[PDB]
Design an enzyme around this catalytic site. Structure first.
Site, short mmCIF file in Angstrom:
data_model
loop_
_atom_site.label_atom_id
_atom_site.label_comp_id
_atom_site.label_asym_id
_atom_site.label_seq_id
_atom_site.Cartn_x
_atom_site.Cartn_y
_atom_site.Cartn_z
N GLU A 57 0.79 -1.21 0.00
CA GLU A 57 0.00 0.00 0.00
C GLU A 57 0.82 1.25 0.00
O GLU A 57 0.46 2.20 -0.72
CB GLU A 57 -0.86 -0.03 1.29
CG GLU A 57 -1.99 -1.07 1.28
CD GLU A 57 -3.07 -0.90 0.15
OE1 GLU A 57 -3.00 0.05 -0.62
OE2 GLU A 57 -3.93 -1.83 0.08
N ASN B 159 -8.23 8.46 -5.47
CA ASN B 159 -9.00 7.39 -6.16
C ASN B 159 -9.85 8.00 -7.26
O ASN B 159 -10.13 9.20 -7.21
CB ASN B 159 -9.90 6.62 -5.23
CG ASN B 159 -9.16 6.08 -4.02
OD1 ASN B 159 -9.44 6.21 -2.87
ND2 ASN B 159 -8.07 5.40 -4.53
N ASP C 198 -12.92 7.92 -7.85
CA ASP C 198 -14.20 8.40 -7.34
C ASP C 198 -14.08 9.69 -6.54
O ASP C 198 -15.07 10.21 -6.05
CB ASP C 198 -14.86 7.33 -6.51
CG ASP C 198 -14.32 6.97 -5.17
OD1 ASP C 198 -13.25 7.49 -4.72
OD2 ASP C 198 -14.86 6.20 -4.36
N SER D 209 -12.29 10.04 -3.64
CA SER D 209 -11.86 9.84 -2.27
C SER D 209 -10.30 9.76 -2.40
O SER D 209 -9.78 9.80 -3.48
CB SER D 209 -12.36 8.52 -1.66
OG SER D 209 -11.93 7.39 -2.48
N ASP E 239 -6.77 7.90 -0.34
CA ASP E 239 -6.26 6.92 0.63
C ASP E 239 -5.01 7.47 1.35
O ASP E 239 -4.19 8.18 0.69
CB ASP E 239 -5.71 5.68 -0.13
CG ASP E 239 -6.83 4.88 -0.78
OD1 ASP E 239 -8.03 5.08 -0.53
OD2 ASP E 239 -6.53 3.91 -1.50
N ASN F 105 -9.06 4.75 3.25
CA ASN F 105 -9.79 5.56 2.31
C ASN F 105 -10.78 6.52 2.98
O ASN F 105 -11.57 6.06 3.80
CB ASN F 105 -10.43 4.57 1.33
CG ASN F 105 -11.14 4.85 0.08
OD1 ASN F 105 -11.67 3.98 -0.70
ND2 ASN F 105 -11.17 6.14 -0.21
N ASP G 138 -14.92 -5.34 9.55
CA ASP G 138 -16.17 -4.86 8.94
C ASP G 138 -16.92 -5.98 8.25
O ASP G 138 -18.00 -5.72 7.71
CB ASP G 138 -15.88 -3.80 7.88
CG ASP G 138 -17.05 -2.90 7.53
OD1 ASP G 138 -17.67 -2.39 8.47
OD2 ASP G 138 -17.25 -2.82 6.32
#
Ligand SMILES: [Cl-]
Ligand SMILES: [Cl-]
Ligand SMILES: [Cl-]
Ligand SMILES: [Cl-]
Ligand SMILES: [Cl-]
Ligand SMILES: [Cl-]
Ligand SMILES: [Cl-]
Ligand SMILES: [Cl-]
Ligand code: NA
Length: 129
Positions: A35, A46, A48, A50, A52, A59, A101
């Site tokens: 990462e 990203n 979209d 967002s 990270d 994110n 999650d």
């Protein structure tokens, strides 16, 4: 800060991530490697909109607030800048929420594609832990 491999393993174990949700420390170090290359200040946008942040590229669509991701949430209840600190405590505590999650470490697409199923103990091999 750019951690060394064993230095990050140790810091992750100090903060309770070794075998957290069954994932051994090598899995965490491997995810960190792909990462962020072990860099706490890593940021990536990203598609979209967002972004990270940090060593485990957490994110803003779900986890942290950066003020510029519409419709997003902040489930770790922290500014995304906190995730860029030389002290990994805010990244570790938010990563504990993320891996709990539902989909374990698969939340990290790079861990699924580059760590899952491999000999992740190589990432802690030889480290005094
Ligand atoms: Cl390395
Ligand atoms: Cl391991
Ligand atoms: Cl936002
Ligand atoms: Cl901006
Ligand atoms: Cl929220
Ligand atoms: Cl905030
Ligand atoms: Cl630390
Ligand atoms: Cl799991
Ligand atoms: Na957010």
């Amino acid at each position: 800060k750019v951690f060394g491999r064993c230095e990050l393993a140790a810091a992750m174990k100090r903060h309770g991530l070794d075998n957290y949700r069954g994932y051994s420390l090598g899995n965490w170090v491997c995810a960190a490697k792909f990462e962020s290359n072990f860099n706490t200040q890593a940021t990536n946008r990203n598609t979209d909109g967002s972004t990270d942040y940090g060593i485990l590229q957490i994110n803003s669509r779900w986890w942290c607030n950066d003020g510029r991701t519409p419709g997003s949430r902040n489930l770790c209840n922290i500014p995304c800048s906190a995730l860029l600190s030389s002290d990994i405590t805010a990244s570790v505590n938010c990563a504990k929420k993320i891996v709990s999650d539902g989909n374990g470490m698969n939340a990290w697409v790079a861990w699924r594609n580059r760590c899952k199923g491999t000999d992740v103990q190589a990432w802690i091999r030889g480290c005094r832990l």
